[PDB]
Scaffold this active site. Sequence first.
Site, PDB file in Angstrom:
ATOM      1  N   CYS A 150      45.162  40.551  35.911  1.00 29.22           N
ATOM      2  CA  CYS A 150      43.792  40.163  35.704  1.00 29.22           C
ATOM      3  C   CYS A 150      43.544  39.488  34.380  1.00 29.22           C
ATOM      4  O   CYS A 150      42.412  38.967  34.279  1.00 29.22           O
ATOM      5  CB  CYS A 150      42.895  41.352  35.887  1.00 29.22           C
ATOM      6  SG  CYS A 150      42.516  41.687  37.595  1.00 29.22           S
ATOM      7  N   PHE A 201      38.132  45.179  44.725  1.00 32.50           N
ATOM      8  CA  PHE A 201      39.016  44.024  44.763  1.00 32.50           C
ATOM      9  C   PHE A 201      38.583  43.070  45.888  1.00 32.50           C
ATOM     10  O   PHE A 201      38.137  43.492  46.950  1.00 32.50           O
ATOM     11  CB  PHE A 201      40.474  44.426  44.985  1.00 32.50           C
ATOM     12  CG  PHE A 201      41.096  45.271  43.901  1.00 32.50           C
ATOM     13  CD1 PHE A 201      40.492  45.507  42.669  1.00 32.50           C
ATOM     14  CD2 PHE A 201      42.326  45.873  44.152  1.00 32.50           C
ATOM     15  CE1 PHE A 201      41.123  46.293  41.722  1.00 32.50           C
ATOM     16  CE2 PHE A 201      42.948  46.646  43.197  1.00 32.50           C
ATOM     17  CZ  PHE A 201      42.343  46.855  42.001  1.00 32.50           C
ATOM     18  N   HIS A 291      36.179  38.939  32.252  1.00 33.06           N
ATOM     19  CA  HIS A 291      36.752  39.371  33.497  1.00 33.06           C
ATOM     20  C   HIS A 291      36.149  40.709  33.908  1.00 33.06           C
ATOM     21  O   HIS A 291      36.289  41.701  33.192  1.00 33.06           O
ATOM     22  CB  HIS A 291      38.257  39.542  33.403  1.00 33.06           C
ATOM     23  CG  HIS A 291      38.818  40.019  34.684  1.00 33.06           C
ATOM     24  ND1 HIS A 291      38.750  39.255  35.835  1.00 33.06           N
ATOM     25  CD2 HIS A 291      39.270  41.239  35.050  1.00 33.06           C
ATOM     26  CE1 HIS A 291      39.186  39.985  36.846  1.00 33.06           C
ATOM     27  NE2 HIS A 291      39.511  41.187  36.398  1.00 33.06           N
TER      28      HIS A 291
END
Lengths: 378, 379
Positions: A150, A201, A291
């Site tokens: 990530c 996710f 993020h």
Amino acid sequence: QHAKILAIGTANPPNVYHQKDYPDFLFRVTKNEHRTDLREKFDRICEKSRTKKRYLHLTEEMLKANPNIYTYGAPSLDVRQDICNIEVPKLGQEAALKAIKEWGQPISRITHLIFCTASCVDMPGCDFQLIKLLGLDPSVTRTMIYEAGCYAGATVLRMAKDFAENNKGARVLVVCAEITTVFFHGLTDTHLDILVGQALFADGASAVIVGANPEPEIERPLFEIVACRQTILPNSEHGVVANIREMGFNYYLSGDVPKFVGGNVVDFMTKTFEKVDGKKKDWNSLFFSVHPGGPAIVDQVEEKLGLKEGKLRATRHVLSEYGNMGAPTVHFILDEMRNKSIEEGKTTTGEGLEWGVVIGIGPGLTVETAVLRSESIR
Amino acid sequence: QHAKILAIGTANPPNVYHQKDYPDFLFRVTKNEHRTDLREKFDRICEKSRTKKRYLHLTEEMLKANPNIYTYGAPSLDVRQDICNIEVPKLGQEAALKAIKEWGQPISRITHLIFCTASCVDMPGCDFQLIKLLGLDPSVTRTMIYEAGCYAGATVLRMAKDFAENNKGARVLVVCAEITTVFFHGLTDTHLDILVGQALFADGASAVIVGANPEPEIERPLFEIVACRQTILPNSEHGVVANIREMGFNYYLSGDVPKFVGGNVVDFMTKTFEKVDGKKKDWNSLFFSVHPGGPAIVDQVEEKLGLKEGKLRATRHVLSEYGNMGAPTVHFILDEMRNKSIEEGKTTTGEGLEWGVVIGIGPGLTVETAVLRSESIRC
């Protein structure tokens, strides 16, 4: 003459999963409706997820055809790979065509390709497959980033910067694509981390074009990539782990990840901006693409940097509408920021501000930051 | 001010397998002595391999403990990964310490790490593990190249060049490490390609330090990385294929790979040198590090470029003494070339010559070339 982002395009699988419906879907299709304890836990996680919907390639029909995918620990890598090794380059192609359209130059002008995915692995790789799909020059200079995780949405910008700045005239296509079929697992009380991934996710792809020395009145820069830094947060090796196994890509997530991020964000921001300016930064003067590994990560950045209400709106919007798509997510956030800035009549692509940052966070724990400047909308 | 190679170190697992003994070993430990048909085929391949010995991590005891590794198609990825995810960074560490010693600077001067392997994959990756082993700065800028294959020994030099040249003062540690335990498969007449990998593939690691603007009191450049090119050879997608499966890392190798290399080598050399000076002929003026994917690839490069006897000695020496270790191999060849040049009293690290090339060849088929200049050997 720093490298500039010249275009951003994005794509997702067609099937939308509203979070309100996902617990019923997950427990039904995996034959776990009797696990009332796990359902309670999953409901609590979904309620806190700050994710309203996600796009996913995986369908119920695929699960019915391949029940090994939801049978915890059963051998299933092969069927997952057979799906993802095809679907990852295809989704990347869709995003790439959108970026290329925006950019406005011929595909033959692309000199470099960076492809990034944590969802599959093959030889030849996704980069090769994308070359075929797009008709890129067979002599494009390639970088294929497999299984970084990530933080890589920042890392690929760093790599693109170096390639664009060191090679006169270079134009770098950067594609990040994720299909989480490989990470889907069934439910066991011995591996509760799966409940978190099941809630958060999601699938998506981004594409960015990067070049230094944009052609005046021809190319239209969106952001400038000024300086980058990568670091390992101390004593956090257990934070995010993912292993490539016979059962698929298995993963573990520590509940302490948000606190680790919060405990390091002042330091990593400070050290990043020291590469650009000797003066202390006011964090509220920046625009942000963070993020959104989970909602608490976003909250930790906001809290420890003292960010005002609404500063992380673009980040939160993408988390809400798309979930955590891995590396592409920060590029969706930049695109959202640019679009909202147009909507609001701001003077720059960065919410009217000059300086900003992209914060990628993944295994290590590793944080990669990219300092950006915005560009004028007009 | 181009990026320079400032040091090269190498390492291999301790156990040596002489080719003369390997057919007996392989057929015995995999319980295939009845396959006299396959033994004939394997003997012919070994005879032509031009590989005298290889270093391998895998042992007979590991096979006895994990017989699925030699049971073709049986699930075995997990045990392979449990080995390789540990052994690959460890072997890389050994090579890296040797490179760092030659380099002569403190480890704190390393700003960038490129780790490359086709033998394992994990998150966090081998790069993270190597940082821990070596005590690199936690803020090193990393590039982790997983599952590229046999072009990557050239590719990592290209990447290191851009990182070193665009980041003033940067010092890039490049580590390529291979442990072929993940690629070991048993024997079936339905997949004869395995006989080729069983004869040729081997274990090893290289480490290279790359930087622009060498520090004269400390650093001693070996080669300069001038220009690079990567290309896909037309109509060759079946040449080298490798899939990451429940049975381990499976691979297929077309018998036509040498012909594709030979058919394209003049063109890819010409297009590479177009980036420098337009060289189009007289290839014997160069020194070479050619990835020795197999003996016939080496012979095709020699033939089609019109190279004289002995031009590819360093390449052939490494193939003979180490086998095909994947990406590190071309770095072993540069190290061998430098060391032979010292032995012979040559004026430069490139066999006395000024210009040379590294040729990496792998899936696609993809060829990456790096044009080098040599450096002087002091008095």
